[PDB]
């Protein structure tokens, strides 16, 4: 049983109805009792209770509840009383009935519900409202989106059976040609296959597609479709692979950033409470920093929160384990292409650049707009050229002039862009260790993200600018395991070769025991090897490395390793995650925000931009646009590149 709420052992329906009656007795009601009851009984038992109540009093429990309660807390409780099928119908009703139209709800339900659930859905709609669901849907949606929805409404998807490897491969190429190989996508094609083929078949098709293409099916869909259809087709895929994972992220999305999408939270927590709530939790914790319980506890309040925490629940299983494993498989096989946001300027004229720069700095005030239009629109290399030119033209150091004429975050941003990669990092590391305390966050981000070549370049740039070895510096500002671990990474001496299934299983065993060598493995093994090592870990312990690190490590030590693991799993994502935090909350960390924007502006910033929008449903553009302002915002948005 992967549900969070199960049948209450030895339950007295008649008494429960009596307790519900007495709970609402007098002015108001004993909400603490109502929630503890309803939330401690299966939807089936709730139906019996609601039944005994109708006879024992001749009143409607749901109608009565609707009166004695109010607010989100009411929607939740009343929603928990409605039969599964009739609950879905209500959600759909609200979505297509009113002012706007919740396509998010339409997609969540229609793309996840099974053939039976779908049939029980449309039936409950016609019964509860005496209206045709297909007609209502068809008349409230347009385009391929409407089509796909109607196809999903038929609930006539071929159900699991023996897979025909011949048809699987035929579908793999069919999809490939209908999408990846073309400018756009054959909607009619994807709708038919992704909508008719069995989940078991498609799952094997998706696996085949990645192994023979290099990228997951969604990678070929993303950006190749438009509007709600893209989202819908991306949701169907996710659901086919794992509905637990779908709701896992769908949930995270409803609580992400100030303000909650309570309507989605209640719908999901209620609908999956007796299906895969447990797996969703196992996946949520693994896929995200905070646990479902923690996220809900911090986003909701009152009885509404207490109820949600009860619905939630608070080793892996066939599902939660599959996802974790497949997560590493993808990261290991996926053929990703790193792309920056700022590219070399065409018709590059250093002489004209240095002139415009010199001009925009003369006088009392400093023309910053021009300074930004140039600097932020030139590759770090071209920038180094403007420095050379500027100097060999005016006999003055551009940096010194820039540093003096500029100030604040802007000065830090602009001057940061003018510094060569290896030197910017060196400066960063030096600052993190200067003064009182250590910017543990800065050191980790860098030392746990940079490569052997990058670390080598850094180690050198450091000795120069700051006559002292990067190690010596580290030993001066840090200590303990944090220092040992950091110093290790600062050696840029990690294995480069491919994976070794032999050593892998061995290394994996080391991680299993912990639940010095571990450090060596996480600091010495090549990323491709570690990727496999983690594959073997989930296969022999049933847990994910992240869980071993969290359970046996804490604080900085735990953050360096998690940073490393994340860097090996999905570097761009790790940065998108860090970029979100910097702008998360009332304040803003222009420091981290600036460091990441600059450092990755020419490596994989575009990649980060996508991982950001996909996971937080909002472009980095708007993300920055809302936090920063003035000239700091102008320059930043320049690096973002759209
Ligand atoms: Ca009310
Ligand atoms: Ca395509
Ligand atoms: Ca929130
Ligand atoms: Ca000036
Ligand atoms: Ca310090
Ligand atoms: Ca902020």
From Swiss-Prot:
One of its GO terms (molecular function) is enzyme binding. Seems to bind one calcium ion with high affinity. Its main location: cytoplasm. Belongs to the annexin family. Phosphorylated in response to growth factor stimulation. GO terms for biological process: apoptotic signaling pathway; biomineral tissue development; calcium ion import; calcium ion transmembrane transport; calcium ion transport; growth plate cartilage chondrocyte differentiation; mitochondrial calcium ion homeostasis; negative regulation of sequestering of calcium ion. The modification Phosphoserine is found at residue 407. The modification N6-acetyllysine is found at residues 54, 59, 66, 72, 297, 355, 403, 468, 591. The modification Phosphotyrosine is found at residue 192. GO terms for cellular component: chromaffin granule membrane; cytoplasm; focal adhesion; melanosome; membrane; mitochondrial crista; nucleus; perinuclear region of cytoplasm. It holds the Pfam family Annexin. May associate with CD21. May regulate the release of Ca(2+) from intracellular stores. It comes from the Eukaryota. Annexin repeats lie at residues 83-154, 166-238, 242-313, 348-419, 420-491, 506-566, 570-641. It is found in: Cytoplasm; Melanosome. The keyword Disulfide bond does not apply. This is Annexin A6. Keywords: Acetylation, Annexin, Calcium, Calcium/phospholipid-binding, Cytoplasm, Phosphoprotein, Repeat. A pair of annexin repeats may form one binding site for calcium and phospholipid. The keyword Repeat applies. PANTHER family: ANNEXIN, ANNEXIN A6. SUPFAM superfamilies: Annexin.
């Amino acid at each position: 049983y992967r549900g969070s709420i199960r049948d209450f052992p030895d339950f007295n329906p008649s008494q429960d109805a009596e307790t519900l009656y007495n709970a609402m007795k007098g002015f108001g009601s004993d909400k603490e009792a109502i929630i503890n009851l309803i939330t401690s009984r299966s939807n089936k038992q709730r139906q019996e209770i609601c039944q005994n109540y109708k006879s024992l009093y001749g009143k409607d429990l749901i109608a009565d509840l609707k009166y004695e309660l109010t607010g989100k807390f009411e929607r939740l409780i009343v929603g928990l009383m409605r039969p599964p099928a009739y609950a879905d119908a209500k959600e759909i009703k609200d979505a297509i009935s009113g002012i706007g139209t919740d396509e998010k709800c339409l997609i969540e339900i229609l793309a996840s519900r099974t053939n039976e659930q779908i049939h029980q859905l449309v039936a409950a709609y016609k019964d509860a409202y005496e209206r045709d669901l297909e007609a209502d849907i068809t008349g409230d949606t347009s385009g391929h989106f409407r089509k796909m929805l109607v196809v999903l409404l038929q609930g006539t998807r071929e159900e699991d059976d023996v897979v025909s490897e011949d048809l699987v491969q035929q579908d793999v190429q069919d999809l490939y040609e209908a999408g990846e190989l073309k400018w756009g996508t054959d909607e009619a094609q994807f709708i038919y296959i992704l909508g008719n083929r069995s989940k078991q078949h498609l799952r094997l098709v998706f696996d085949e597609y990645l192994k023979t293409t290099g990228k997951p099916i969604e990678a070929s869909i993303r950006g190749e479709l438009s509007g709600d259809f893209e989202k819908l087709m991306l949701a169907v895929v996710k659901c086919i692979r794992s509905t637990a994972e779908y709701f896992a992220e769908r949930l995270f999305k409803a609580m992400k950033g100030l303000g909650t999408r309570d309507n989605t939270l209640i719908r999901i927590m209620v609908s999956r409470s007796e299906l895969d709530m447990l797996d969703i939790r196992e996946i949520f914790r693994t896929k995200y920093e905070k646990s479902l319980y923690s996220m809900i506890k911090n986003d909701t309040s009152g009885e509404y929160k207490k109820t949600l925490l009860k619905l939630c629940g608070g080793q892996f299983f066939p599902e939660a384990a599959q996802v974790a494993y497949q997560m590493w498989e993808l990261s290991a096989v996926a053929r990703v292409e790193l792309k920056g946001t700022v590219r070399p300027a065409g018709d590059f004229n250093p002489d004209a650049d240095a002139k415009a720069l010199r001009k925009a700095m003369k006088g009392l005030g400093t023309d910053e707009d021009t300074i930004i239009d140039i600097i932020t629109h030139r590759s770090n290399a071209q920038r180094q050229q403007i420095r050379q030119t500027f100097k060999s033209h005016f006999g003055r150091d551009l940096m010194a002039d820039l540093k003096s004429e500029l100030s604040g975050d802007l000065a830090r941003l602009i001057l940061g862009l003018m510094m060569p990669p290896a030197h910017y990092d060196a400066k960063q590391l030096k600052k993190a260790m200067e003064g009182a305390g250590t910017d543990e966050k800065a050191l980790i981000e860098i030392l746990a993200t940079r490569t052997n070549a990058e670390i080598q370049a850094i180690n050198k740039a450091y000795k120069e600018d700051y006559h002292k070895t990067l190690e010596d510096a580290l030993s001066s500002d840090t200590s303990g395991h944090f220092k040992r671990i950091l110093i290790s990474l600062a050696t840029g001496n990690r294995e480069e070769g491919g994976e070794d299934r032999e050593r892998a299983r061995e290394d994996a065993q080391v991680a299993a025991e912990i639940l010095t060598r571990f450090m060596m493995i996480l600091c010495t093994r090549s990323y491709p090897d570690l990727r496999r090592v983690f594959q073997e870990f989930v296969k022999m312990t049933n847990y994910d490395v992240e869980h071993t690190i969290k359970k046996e490590m804490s604080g900085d030590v735990r953050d360096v390793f998690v940073a490393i693991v994340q860097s090996v799993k999905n570097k761009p994502l790790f940065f998108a995650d860090k970029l979100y935090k910097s702008m998360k909350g009332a304040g803003t960390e222009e420091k981290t925000l600036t460091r990441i924007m600059v450092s990755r502006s020419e490596i994989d910033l575009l990649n980060i931009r996508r991982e950001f929008i996909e996971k937080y449903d909002k472009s980095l553009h708007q993300a920055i646009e809302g936090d920063t302002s003035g000239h700091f915002l102008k320059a930043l948005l320049a690096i973002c590149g759209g």
